[PDB]
Design a protein around this nucleic acid. Structure first.
Ligand SMILES: O[B-](O)(O)O
Ligand SMILES: O[B-](O)(O)O
Lengths: 374, 377
RNA sequence: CCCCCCC
RNA sequence: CCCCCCC
RNA sequence: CCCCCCC
């Protein structure tokens, strides 16, 4: 039978990768700081110091943010996530030590962390500049409220909130999302920006973009932290904001998959086209593959998962075009940098979708109506 | 087939979070007082002291209320709830000690608790001001009845009754509910307010609002206490009031879910609309998800559970609008701060719902009627 | 190669 | 982001 | 909040 002449390449390719007899292990570099729960409070204070600092130097915030996420996971778990990801790790133990240095003649004491990635000389400067901003703040308002200070438990998570926004736009893979990252960091997180002078979306977002670009293993660390954080029973409102923003990243780099379901849901006529119907057998394969993977597939593009390519609908020019057309006709795309391979099908689908948002007839068969006198 | 082109994002997102291989542990701060059952009676007396005090300082009532809830749970269980929630806890043992201090020259004895959160100096002042209010009360009525005194077992739970009302309106997350909290604390809990001069709904409600804002882990403690309390076989009438008020919180921050079932139940015509029908596949996913979670989902918004966002119907502009319309047409909303994304669908649904409350024909097929002679009646 | 919107 | 009523 | 009769 001609029905038997088929080959499920999408499923078979996944099968090949899922059933590997051998494994690779990547060298991360020299050393990774793995802070445990004991150091967590200190990192939160360090995060707060950057947040209180007016016109702060967010060169290290991306890395500091990562340290806080790791301190929440705790040494044991963070090492486990690094090893499970496929990395050879030389773990550096983070401990609190008192450093004595004479700044402006007067000998001063500082509580610093034993970090390889962060110098003790740069750590003291974060505290130095924060104290300047704190005394200026104390001079302006007399007494500083718990909301405006570096001590606040929200501090670490506030920084990680923009990290969740960076992760949201990593699918583009070129820092193009930065504008949207800043925009959203202003709409959401508005109250947080009021309390902290150092909450500079652009500055912090670039720092995280840099850390994820320079250290791709940290993106795996963050994604797994975010999931672990989102597994919690409850928490603060800032922790709720983070969880929401982190979940906005789920399904990034696979918008066509969701827009495809939309086109079906709105019943765009162009889906029934002969050239679109030819692709159907194979488009179902990818949808069934996406269904099979479940939650796992959500962060496939964020973390550069090799199997992310398998979820592409771009390989089907006709279906992608009607899907993209429907999205344009419903006015839901833009400035989406996706181009339709078949222009005629796109234009036809865009036209029908534009006509759909003008009509709308009531389907009385859906409702459980008895004696109708309507 | 085009029927196969689907993706259950709601279910998959939950699956991802439910199957986490790794865990986070949060630092609560420095120390949390974990009082055991032995200290429970003392806290109830302290609660009673604030309740007998005319124009009492309810600055610490939110925290004292939490201590009573923890003393009912008992050290072991409270530590367990804190650890299960995802918090690193340095437990402080609460013990009763006698403190001698000379107030107005005369050396006085006081029974105080070894609390980190509450100073022994502030504890004595609660007792000092209560004694003043007690002697004034003794001068007014001669003999003080068991209902009017601080000794009463209801005291601790009376304070926790307004804590249940605060928890009821935490979904708004901005203290906006305070007006309703006070209002309800007057309708319900009316007899309790008669017996206690210090039962100031506004003052106590703000204290609990503050404690839940400053210490988010305490909201987890309270919710779990409330469930544990509501698991009881029986109790006092005040304990019954609490249980009822605590259960009013179940499903807060998810009113649209319940109003959606209402729209279906009343058979609002606008549900059959083309743009509403397109969303249907996905709206069922969330309803089935809510059905799957069961009782767990009830306090998802109260405790800032990460998965609470997944229960939102706001992501479906058309369905939400008809649901909100039906709620307005039936006159059940207001002043609900929810805005319909599709105005035309809302107005159409509001109109139909208004027409529904005017009609009403009897459906005789529902009843198990045999030989019908009602048409003659 | 894949990706690219909004929230 | 989510939420927001009444009881 | 719930409840509220009779036997
Ligand atoms: O543990 B180290 O090497 O002191 O940082
Ligand atoms: O147990 B403590 O430390 O005495 O309160």
């Amino acid at each position: 039978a001609l029905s038997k002449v088929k080959l499920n390449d999408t499923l078979n390719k996944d099968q090949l990768l899922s059933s590997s007899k051998y494994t690779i292990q990547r060298s991360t570099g020299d050393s990774i700081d793995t802070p445990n729960y004991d150091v967590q409070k200190h990192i939160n204070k360090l995060c707060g110091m950057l947040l209180i600092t007016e016109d702060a130097n967010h060169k290290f915030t991306g890395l500091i943010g990562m340290l806080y996420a790791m301190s929440r996971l705790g040494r044991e778990d963070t090492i486990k996530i690094l090893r499970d990801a496929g990395y050879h790790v030389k773990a550096n133990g983070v401990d609190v030590t008192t450093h004595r240095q004479d700044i402006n003649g007067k000998e001063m004491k500082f509580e610093v962390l034993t970090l390889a990635s962060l110098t003790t000389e740069i750590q003291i400067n974060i505290e130095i500049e924060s104290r300047k901003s704190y005394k200026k703040m104390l001079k302006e308002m007399g007494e500083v409220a718990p909301e405006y200070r570096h001590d606040s438990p929200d501090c670490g998570m506030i920084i990680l909130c923009i990290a969740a926004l960076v992760i949201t736009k990593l699918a583009a893979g070129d820092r193009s999302g930065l504008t949207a990252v800043i925009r959203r960091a202003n709409n959401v997180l508005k109250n947080e920006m009021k309390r902290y002078k150092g909450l500079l979306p652009k500055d912090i977002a670039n720092s995280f973009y840099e850390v994820f670009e320079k250290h791709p293993h940290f993106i795996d660390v963050f994604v797994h932290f975010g999931i672990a954080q989102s597994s919690t029973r409850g928490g603060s409102r800032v922790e709720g904001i983070f969880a929401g923003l982190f979940m906005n990243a789920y399904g990034a780099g696979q918008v066509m998959l969701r827009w495809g379901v939309l086109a079906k849901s709105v019943k765009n006529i162009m889906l029934g086209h002969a050239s679109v119907q030819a692709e159907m057998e194979q488009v179902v394969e990818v949808y069934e593959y996406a269904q099979k993977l479940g939650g796992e597939a959500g962060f496939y593009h964020i973390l550069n998962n090799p199997k992310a390519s398998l979820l592409s609908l771009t390989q089907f020019p006709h279906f992608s075009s009607v899907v993209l057309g429907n999205a344009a006709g419903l006015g839901i795309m833009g400035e989406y940098r996706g181009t339709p391979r078949n222009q005629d099908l796109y234009d036809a689908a865009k036209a029908y979708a534009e006509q759909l948002k003008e009509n709308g007839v009531i389907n009385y068969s859906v409702l459980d109506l008895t004696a109708e006198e309507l």
